[PDB]
Amino acid sequence: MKVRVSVKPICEKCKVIKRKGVLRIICDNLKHKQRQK
Amino acid sequence: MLGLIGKKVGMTQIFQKNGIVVPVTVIEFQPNYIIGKKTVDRDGYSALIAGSVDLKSSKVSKPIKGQYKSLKDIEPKRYVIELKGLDGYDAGDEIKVDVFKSVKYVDVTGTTKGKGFQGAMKRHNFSGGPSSHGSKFHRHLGGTGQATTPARTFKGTKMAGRMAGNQQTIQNLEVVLIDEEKRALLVKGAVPGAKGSFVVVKKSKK
Amino acid sequence: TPHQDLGDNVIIINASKVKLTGKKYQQKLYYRHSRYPGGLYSDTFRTL
Amino acid sequence: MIQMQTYLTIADNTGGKVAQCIKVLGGSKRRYAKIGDIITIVVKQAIPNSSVKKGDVYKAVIVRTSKEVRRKNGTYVRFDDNACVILDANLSPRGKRVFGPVARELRDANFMKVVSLASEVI
Amino acid sequence: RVGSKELISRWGGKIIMKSKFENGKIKHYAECQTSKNTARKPRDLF
Amino acid sequence: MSRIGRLPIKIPDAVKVDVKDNLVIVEGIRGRLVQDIKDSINVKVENGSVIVDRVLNDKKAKAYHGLYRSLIFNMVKGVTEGFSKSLTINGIGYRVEQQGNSLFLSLGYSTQFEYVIPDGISVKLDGNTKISVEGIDKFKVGQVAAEIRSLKKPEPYKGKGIKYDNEVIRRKVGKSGVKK
RNA sequence: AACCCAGACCAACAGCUAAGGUCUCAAAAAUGUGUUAAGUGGAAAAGGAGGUUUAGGUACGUAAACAGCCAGGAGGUUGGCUUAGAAGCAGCCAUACCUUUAAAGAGUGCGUAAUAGCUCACUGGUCGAGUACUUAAGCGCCGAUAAUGUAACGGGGCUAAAC
RNA sequence: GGACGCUGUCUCAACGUGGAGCUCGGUGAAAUUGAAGUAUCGGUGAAGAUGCCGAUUACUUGUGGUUAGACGGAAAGACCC
RNA sequence: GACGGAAGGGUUUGGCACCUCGAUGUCGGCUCAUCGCAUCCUAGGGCUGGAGCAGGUCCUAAGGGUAUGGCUGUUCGCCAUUUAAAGCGGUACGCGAGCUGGGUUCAGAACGUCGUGAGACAGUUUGGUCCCUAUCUGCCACAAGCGUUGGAUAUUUGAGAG
RNA sequence: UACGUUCGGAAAGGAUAACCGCUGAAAGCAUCUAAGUGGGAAGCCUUCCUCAAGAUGAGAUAUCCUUUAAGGGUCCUGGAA
Ligand SMILES: [Zn+2]
Structure with a gap:
């Protein structure tokens, strides 16, 4: 979702x-999910 | 794959019972015989060699003659093809036209009509230039490449040249009628080749 | 002598069991071009 | 074989007498309309003081063409002028009566009410 | 409205869609009640 | 490394374990399971117990330590007590039924889903809205439960779908929750 | 052509060397101790970063640290309020607010109009050594991204034939 | 600029006709030309390579067609200085 | 997502004057395309302040498709109807030894402005020759010769390519 | 010849992109990954049609011939070319 460069x-x-x-971020608050670009 | 060597007689139309017209192509089937077999352990693959209408005994070369030495009462055949991965027959057999009796669709392979040296506008549906308003450009190619890059014409650019004469196989022709006594098959639609050219009819893949 | 052909001949057996290191088995690419426009075909080591 | 710019007879009692095709609907490069297709027309000539003014844009259905089109049973029907009928938003005839004959492909294109209001169906 | 064609097999059997499962594969396929021949698209059973 | 890698493995009496040539066989009351073990890790059976250590101290070996300890432990707990993971089907008109070695799912789609059950795994029903997959291998049990859940993943507006029983679905609101 | 090495008098089927190289195309390398998993080597930024080697600080610990697991996680007290409500979680102010204190913050978050409700810091038991935050270097990761054809190692290939 | 009529201008091209074109016999030029056992791609370079580098592809030689290139031919650039 | 900060792309307006003035033909339209993905449509998803329908944002994906007209020389743009969509760009702002010459950029003439004047004006209007038989490479087609290890005649497996 | 007729874009399989996993570490938890093992698109590879052993790596087989034989070519009558 937040395909960013700073995760x-x-x-x-x-x-x-x-x-x-x-590099990825995982959380219960699926709104917080992330991956580095 | 069940197949036969037929001759495209021509086209006509028939009237279904309720009045609906169906345009059909008629194919006449000279007797087809099994001339030999190809085996995976000896030739590398399994196929049946099938032959059709005879040659004149003055114009059969001896290699062709010896091809039929072991067969009894089977004269040399002018049209010979192979049916890959077929069983239920062996050398000396003979295939009726009724092998299609249970088949709904067929595929036909033949040599399309030749159109000679043909131009781009017929060959590739190129539009042309205008015929008025000062035009000096009617049925030419137009531009063919780009300017300096690539400084050549790409391989496969479509230009003038010979048209048709290739093989082609048309798919899923509906089977309208089978007539054993006159050795004829009536399929619905067009079949490649001119009148009297010889086609190969196979059971449809789908 | 580099001019002429003086070496012997070679038969390679078991050519299908050469081992690679690293991720080459998944990543090494063998390219080829048909000379037609856009006709570039790749083929990884597995498939080739 | 109605295309753009073709003139058509309006065959109903809305008031218009001549229409011009300005678009063939249902298709990107679609170029020809046949019997039972819907086109977008502009009105080029109308009965005075009618509910349809010259220069309005409506949708219309084609009821007669001058180019024959094959039917299943092999018969071809070729009229003598091109004619259409105006439709309202529900894709139903805006008028109350239809002049002259129509072709029976309206039956299949599901314009049963145009067919009924017609005089003869050929 | 040319009458809504009843979705019938060439052997008089109703054609119904099932979803087989096999090894991570959902498969959709067409099945004829009368003759139990399994095909995958009712095109092949008309 | 960390204590799970070095924690010893108890062996139930009914359960037998054996190690040979980079392979392990665990034979119990309910079945037999096999595993590969990599070269850098050594597995020993002594005093009715299983121990694992590493010849090297590279990080691959560090991870392998715990990995194989845990696998062999789940390999022994399976042959004694078996693994079981359960599921619930919630929603209007959703049903599950069993015939032989396959399950039939009615999940709102215009087709009724058939589901072949892979071998080595049993399925248990509770009415027509509760499922429980049982088997010898935790990996296989999890796989089957996951693939069934994927057949109809749950949703947050009403809880409809096929959920793990232990799972908690975060829930949203629709029309009336936004009431002003 | 302009960079690096080196100033061609001619001849020799002689030797030693400079730059640059020594798996192979292609004439020339092997051994020693480490690093790298990205083919990095064989393009690049702000920034992100539980990648890893080595070295060093500050917290914390065999008198039980951290993570998990089992409990409490409060009473005064709706802290006074602004507001309509604000009960720990619109918002103002501090919380130099005390007690039972094991430990409980004028509460970490979720969520309720307002609570209610669920959780955490906080502390106790089961377990049993390093852990938790940072600093300096050696290599790495993402960021990385154009148009005829792999095309940012010369190619093959190379986990060394890389540093 | 608009309208009527009319139409292959166009949707959308098809067929036929006459002279060239094609084959053979006779006669027989031209501008041009350092020559030549003159391929492509990514590069490099007086900054757009048939001739250089690396790689890829390609049996030898003609004929009928087509002009992308040979910064094609023609005119010691007319524009600018 | 303001205020700032770090880059890439080489398409816009420019900078430089390195190749070409014993000539590298300049804008659009026509014809024919090929390639890139920074995706207009169709396909697969993550999250939504996503009930559903319909969207918003981001990621993967270039196989195919991506309209006809009115005005203007126009590219562009506006507008009328459509459509699943009416993509953005490179290729000498693709393509004049393939076409058109409306525009620009010759000599005629006229208007406005500037100049005493000859004349001038990225001001306007009107009229105004677009040359070349393909040697080579390239490409579209068709043959002659020989090879494939004795020489021929049929039937075919298939690398590879479209 | 199209303005006409008929047919075609598939179905299935393999390996994958983003994504979702299962089992599980390094880091007692947690974690789609580090050992493994799965799903997953008009894209890629097979499948459909055409060309194809000048593929010089020139393949495979059946038959004919053994000092000019087998066979082919020229010439002529022609065509569906
Ligand atoms: Zn979070």
């Missing part, structure tokens, strides 16, 4: 992972 946690519940070579 940061938004709330304290967001968590940072790295999948197949891209």
Whole structure:
């Protein structure tokens, strides 16, 4: 959703992972999801 | 794949029972025989060799003659093709026209009519220039490439040249009528080739 | 001598079992061009 | 074979007497309309003091063409002038009566009420 | 309105769409009650 | 590394474990499961227990430590107690039925979905809106439950769909929640 | 053509070297200790970043740290209010507000017109060593993105034949 | 600028006719031309390469067609200085 | 998403004057296209302050398709009807040894303005020769010769290409 | 020859893009990934039609001939070319 270049946690519940070579943010608040461009 | 070597007699039309007209092409089937077999362990693939209308005994070369040495009472055949992956027949057999009796659609393969050296406007549906308003450009190609890049004409650019003469196989022709006594098949639509040219009829793929 | 042909001949067996390292098995590309416009065809190591 | 700029006889009692085709509907490069198709017409001539003025744009259905079109049973019907009938928003005849004959492809194109109001169906 | 054609097989059986499942595949296919021949598009059963 | 990698594996009495040539076989009351083990990790059965360690200390080996410990543990818990993951079908007119080794789903679509059940896995019903997949392999059980859920993923406006029982669906509002 | 090495008197089927190279096209390298997983090497920015090597600080800990698991997570007290409501979570002010205190903040978030309701910091038990935030370097990741044809290693290929 | 009539101007092109074109016999030029066992792509370069680099593709040689290139031919650029 | 900050693209208006003035023909339209994806439509999705219908934003995706007319020399734009959509660009602002010459950029003449005047004006109006038989490469088609290891005649597997 | 007639764009399969996973670590949790293992588009590869052994890597087979034979060509009558 927020295909950005700076991916940061938004709330304290967001968590940072790295999948197949891209940096991603996963959270319960699906509105907070992210991936690096 | 079930197939036969027929001859395109021509076209006509028939009247369905309730009055609806169906335009048909008529194909006449000279007797077709199985001349030989091709085997996966000896030729690399499995197919049946099928032959049709005979040649004149003065114009059969001896290789062709020896092709039929082991067959009994089968004269040399002018039109020979192969039916890949077919069974239920063996050398010396003979295929009726009724093998299509249970078939709804067929495919026909033949040599399309030749149109000679034909220009771009007929060959590729090119439009032309205007015929008035000072035009000196009527049925020429127009531009063909770009300016300096690429400084050549790309391979496959469509220009003038010979038209038709290729094989072509037309698909899903409905089967309208089968007539065993006169050895004829009536399909609905057009079939490539001129009158008297020889086509190959196969069971439809779909 | 580079002028002439003086070396021997070679028969390679088991050519289908050459091993690669890294992700080459998924990523090495073999290209070819039909000389027609746009006719560039690629083929990864697996498929080739 | 009605195309753009073709003149047509309005065959109903709305008031118009001549219409001009200005678009063939239902298709991007569509160029010809046949019997039972819907076109967009402008009115080029009308009965004075009518409910249809010259220069208005409506939708109309083609009821007679001068070029024959094949039918299933092999018969071709070729009229002697091109004629159409004006439609309202519901794709139903705006008028109350239809002059002259119409062709029976209206039946299949589902214009049953035009067919009924016609005089002869050929 | 040319009468709504009843969706019938060439063998007089009703044609109904089922969704097989196989190995991560949903498959849609057409089935004829009378003759139980499975095809995948009712085109092939008219 | 971390304590899950080194935590010892208890062996139930009814359950047998064996290791040989980069392979492990676990035979229990309810079935037999097999696993590959990579070279950098060594698996030992002693004193009715399973231990795992690493020849090297590269990070691949670090991760492998825990990975294979957990797998063998789930490989032993399966052969003793089996794995089970359950599901609920919620929504108007949604139904599930069973015939032999296949399930038939009515999920609002214009076609009734058939569903072949892969072997090694059993399915249990509770009425026509509750399912429970049981089996020997946790991986397979999760796979089947997931693929069934994908057949009709849930939605947030009314809870309709096929949900994991343990799952909590976040819920939104529609018309009347926006009332002024 | 302008950069690097090097000033051609002619001849030799001699040797040593400069720049630049030593898997192969293509004449020339092997061993030692590490780093890199991106084919980085073999283009580039602001910025993001639980990639990893090495070194060093500040928190915190075998007298139990962190994550999980099991509990409490309060009473005074609707903190006084602005407002219509504001009960911890429109908004103003501090919370030098105390007690039972294990520990409970004038509450971390979710969500209720207003609460209500669900959670957390906070602390206790089960477990059993490093963890949690940062600093400097060595290589890396994303950002990376044009039009005839792979086309930003010369090619093949290379996990070294890379640094 | 508009209207009527009329029409292949156009949708949309098709067929036929006459002279060229094509084949053979006779006669027989032209501008042009450093020559030539003169391919393509990505590059490089007096900054748009048949001739250089790397790679790809291509049996030898004619004929009827087509003009993308050979910064084509023709006129010591008329514009500008 | 203001206020600022960091880049790419080489298409706009420009900068420089490196190739070409013993000539590299300039705007549009016609004909014929080919390529890029920064996607107009169709296809697959994530999130919505997404009930549904219909959208908004972002990601993946270039296979195919992407209208006819009125005005203007116009590209462009506006407008009329349509359409699933009426994409944005590169290619000597693709394409005049393929076409048109309306526009621009010759000599005629006229209007306005400037100049005493000859005349001048990215002001306007009207009229005004668009040359060349393809040697080579390239491309569209068709043959002659030979090769494929004895020489021929039929039937075909298929790399590869459209 | 189209303005006419008929037919064609498929169905299925494989590997994938974005996306969604299952099982699970490094990091006791969590996590689609690091070992594995799945779904997933008019795109890619097969499938449909045409050309095709000058594919010099010149393939495979059946038959004919063994000192000019098998066979082909020229010439002539012609065509569906
Ligand atoms: Zn969050």
